[PDB]
Amino acid sequence: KTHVQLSLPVLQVRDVLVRGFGDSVEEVLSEARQHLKDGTCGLVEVEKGVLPQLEQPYVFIKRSDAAPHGHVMVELVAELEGIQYGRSGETLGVLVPHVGEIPVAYRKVLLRK
Numbered sequence: 001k002t003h004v005q006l007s008l009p010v011l012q013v014r015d016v017l018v019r020g021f022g023d024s025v026e027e028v029l030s031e032a033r034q035h036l037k038d039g040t041c042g043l044v045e046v047e048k049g050v051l052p053q054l055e056q057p058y059v060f061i062k063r064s065d066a067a068p069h070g071h072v073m074v075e076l077v078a079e080l081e082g083i084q085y086g087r088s089g090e091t092l093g094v095l096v097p098h099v100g101e102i103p104v105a106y107r108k109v110l111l112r113k
Helices: 025-038
Strands: 003-010 041-044 059-065 073-079 081-083 091-097 105-112
Touching: 025 041, 025 059, 025 073, 025 091, 073 091, 081 105, 091 105
Parallel strands: 003 041, 073 105
Antiparallel strands: 003 105, 041 091, 059 073, 059 091, 073 081
């Protein structure tokens, strides 16, 4: 399927144990997609002071359209030293590995895969 319904655990930035997906734009997008498929991907809502507490390159989920079954359609955009790889809509948050942190909420998305 070109899209997959996911419910992503929303994590507090200070709880996150693994603060990024790797060391290159290509690796972080690769690992993010693998963790999304394996159900091991969390979401941190971007506010003042969040991104400096996480590791670059960043992987964002961005709104790709204006929401089937309650699931917002999203795609992945990576960022490294202020340059983005991909073009999309409003940021829903930054993806991180999930390794058992307790979420505060869930974010239903339809991921362009």
